[PDB]
Write a protein that binds this ligand. Structure first.
Ligand SMILES: [Cl-]
Ligand SMILES: [Cl-]
Ligand SMILES: [Cl-]
Ligand SMILES: [Cl-]
Ligand SMILES: [Cl-]
Ligand code: NA
Length: 257
């Protein structure tokens, strides 16, 4: 298919994105925090990014590929060398930076949150991931792996995810054109499912705008999709770029997408 995207290198695209963010009621403080991370990241990796033909210097680019190619190995090398004491923010943290206020969480999680160890360390040591105690507990309660029954029926898994979030007293604020796309992967070895990739979806007149932190040490990417179908397919291609693995469970808030 075709991907229309921006890495938010230019200030005009950033301004554009900020407007759309502000229009959807995202806290202006969190928008600034997100934008500073974007600039701070871009500044750090500019010499690498500028050698990537697929990264736009201004406006949106286009490529007939399943994913935008990035020099993931060199980007990670540069991060580790310059910031050796902690990790960059990831998909979960970034998504949360923008969507935490649209999630209700009323239960402290004291289950198995081992999958978030890196994330939690970043939240403690990286200014880009600063969150209040309440928001950190929400983060853990929302993203901790969900117990699964090793079933390969996506519908059944989706229902277990929904049920588990209910048991954790998690709910989504209603009447919003902004929603979170959670790409769950099943891990039979640990009898659970966990959010392998995530990003925020915003419906506009042009279609749908998807925002994400491509991965830790990886670039930020904003993509313009025609419909939700392309968003689902995008998340799939991102999760399936990783021989005998279970298909992902792509959730749109608490509903199978
Ligand atoms: Cl192409
Ligand atoms: Cl790159
Ligand atoms: Cl590492
Ligand atoms: Cl809350
Ligand atoms: Cl607090
Ligand atoms: Na790596």
């Amino acid at each position: 298919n075709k991907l229309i995207y921006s890495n938010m290198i230019d200030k005009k695209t950033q301004n554009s994105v900020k407007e759309i963010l502000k229009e959807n009621k995202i806290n202006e403080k969190d928008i600034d925090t997100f934008i500073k991370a974007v600039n701070n990241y871009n500044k750090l990796q500019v010499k690498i990014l500028q050698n990537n033909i697929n990264i736009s210097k201004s406006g949106y680019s286009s490529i007939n590929a399943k994913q935008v190619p990035y020099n993931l190995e060199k980007l990670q090398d540069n991060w580790v060398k310059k910031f050796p004491d902690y990790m960059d923010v990831n998909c979960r943290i970034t998504a949360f930076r923008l969507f935490k206020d649209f999630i209700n969480s009323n239960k402290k999680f004291t289950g198995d949150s081992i999958d978030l160890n890196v994330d939690l360390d970043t939240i403690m040591n990286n200014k880009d991931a600063k969150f209040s105690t309440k928001d950190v507990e929400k983060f853990i309660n929302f993203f901790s792996a969900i117990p699964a029954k090793d079933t390969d029926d996506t519908i059944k898994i989706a229902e277990q995810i929904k049920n588990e979030w209910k048991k954790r007293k998690i709910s989504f604020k209603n009447n919003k054109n902004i929603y979170i796309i959670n790409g769950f992967l099943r891990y039979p070895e640990t009898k659970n499912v966990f959010i392998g990739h995530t990003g925020i979806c915003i419906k506009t007149k042009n279609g749908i705008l998807f925002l994400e932190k491509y991965g830790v040490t990886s670039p930020y990417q904003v993509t313009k999709f025609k419909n939700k179908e392309d968003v689902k397919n995008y998340m799939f291609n991102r999760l399936k770029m990783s021989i005998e693995l279970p298909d992902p469970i792509i959730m749109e808030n608490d509903k199978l997408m």
